[PDB]
Amino acid sequence: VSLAQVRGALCGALLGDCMGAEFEGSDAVELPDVLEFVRLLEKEKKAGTLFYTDDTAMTRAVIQSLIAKPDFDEVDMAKRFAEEYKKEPTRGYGAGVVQVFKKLLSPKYSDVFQPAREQFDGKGSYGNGGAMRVASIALAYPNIQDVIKFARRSAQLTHASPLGYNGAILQALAVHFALQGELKRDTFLEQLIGEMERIEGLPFCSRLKKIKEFLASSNVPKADIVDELGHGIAALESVPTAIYSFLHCMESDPDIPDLYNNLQRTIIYSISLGGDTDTIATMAGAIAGAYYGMDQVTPSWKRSCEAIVETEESAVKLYELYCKQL
Numbered sequence: 001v002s003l004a005q006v007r008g009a010l011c012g013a014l015l016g017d018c019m020g021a022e023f024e025g026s027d028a029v030e031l032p033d034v035l036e037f038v039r040l041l042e043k044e045k046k047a048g049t050l051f052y053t054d055d056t057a058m059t060r061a062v063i064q065s066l067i068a069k070p071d072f073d074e075v076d077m078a079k080r081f082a083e084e085y086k087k088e089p090t091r092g093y094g095a096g097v098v099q100v101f102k103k104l105l106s107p108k109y110s111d112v113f114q115p116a117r118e119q120f121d122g123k124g125s126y127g128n129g130g131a132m133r134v135a136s137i138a139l140a141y142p143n144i145q146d147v148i149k150f151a152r153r154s155a156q157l158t159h160a161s162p163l164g165y166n167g168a169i170l171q172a173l174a175v176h177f178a179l180q181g182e183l184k185r186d187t188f189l190e191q192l193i194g195e196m197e198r199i200e201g202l203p204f205c206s207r208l209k210k211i212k213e214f215l216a217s218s219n220v221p222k223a224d225i226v227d228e229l230g231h232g233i234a235a236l237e238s239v240p241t242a243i244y245s246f247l248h249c250m251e252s253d254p255d256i257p258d259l260y261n262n263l264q265r266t267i268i269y270s271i272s273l274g275g276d277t278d279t280i281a282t283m284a285g286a287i288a289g290a291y292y293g294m295d296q297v298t299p300s301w302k303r304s305c306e307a308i309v310e311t312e313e314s315a316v317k318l319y320e321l322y323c324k325q326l
């Protein structure tokens with residue numbers, strides 16, 4: 001695993017969040033809007049015109065916890081989540097998860113997992129908020145067993161439903177396997193299916209099997225992807241879609257100009273799917289970034305993003321943590 005890959009993953013996550021943010025929840029977004037957006041963005045004279053959202057706010061909190069406590073400290077991490085919320089509450093947090101932060105900030109809970117368990121009448125959140133921030137677990141911990149147990153724990157601080165935390169594990173594993181050289185598309189899916197069959201044993205495996213079917217077809221319409229995989233706030237309806245976006249964009253897409261590289265193509269395609277665009281693109285962007293590396297994060301794109309320099313600095317620190325774990 002190279003510095004290029006860790007850098008790529010975090011910068012890809014940042015780009016996906018920043019670029020996807022203006023379209024999130026849009027019923028009307030289609031590819032022409034996204035292509036226009038990109039060509040305008042590339043000519044913007046001022047840097048830093050795209051602000052990040054909760055997806056990145058929580059990512060940065062995860063990273064600062066991993067650097068402060070590299071053996072993984074869920075109490076430290078919970079505190080950083082709640083304090084980040086308190087400091088910048090308008091970044092775009094889910095309507096449910098705010099109550100978790102409020103309870104963590106209160107004196108009443110000793111068990112930092114207990115607020116999450118109380119969400120949605122004790123069923124817990126099945127939102128994608130655990131998955132949107134989880135990439136860095138795969139960037140800090142080379143051992144897959146660590147990736148799984150820490151992805152799960154980091155997610156369970158807000159997402160107590162298995163759909164929520166298994167979605168976070170799935171996203172962490174997709175980044176993990178993308179880091180392993182440049183696996184062939186079919187090997188990558190086989191790796192993910194193998195792991196999720198064990199973990200769920202099966203909603204996420206079902207979606208991964210559909211993905212295998214889609215990848216074996218040609219010219220699959222957006223509507224079929226949306227209808228079968230989803231583009232929603234639920235982890236089940238967003239994490240597989242992000243994985244699909246990444247795997248699809250390993251090859252040319254006839255509607256996206258081939259002057260865009262694979263990572264750019266992945267982000268554009270993700271956003272073009274509509275729905276939860278900042279989170280699907282932040283997840284697909286983390287996976288693509290880990291896979292292709294920083295070579296595909298172009299200067300005109302990355303300069304557009306709030307906190308790019310801090311993000312690059314944090315990628316160097318995560319890389320050193322990863323190397324130390326070896």
Ligand SMILES: N=C(NCCC[C@H](N)C(=O)O)N[C@H]1O[C@H](COP(=O)(O)OP(=O)(O)OC[C@H]2O[C@@H](n3cnc4c(N)ncnc43)[C@H](O)[C@@H]2O)[C@@H](O)[C@H]1O
Nearest residue numbers: 092093094095096097120123124125126127128129276279
């Ligand atoms: N929240 C948004 N965007 C909405 C607009 C934001 C607006 N601009 C603002 O500033 O307020 N995006 C971000 O949140 C998503 C991830 O949310 P997370 O999973 O962290 O949130 P939460 O746990 O609150 O769940 C989200 C919603 O899912 C439904 N839900 C979840 N579990 C449920 C359950 N067991 N039963 C019923 N409903 C459940 C609820 O509708 C929750 O409010 C990302 O997209 C991020 O970008």
Ligand SMILES: [Mg+2]
Nearest residue numbers: 053054055092
């Ligand atoms: Mg957001």
Ligand SMILES: [Mg+2]
Nearest residue numbers: 024276278279
């Ligand atoms: Mg979102």
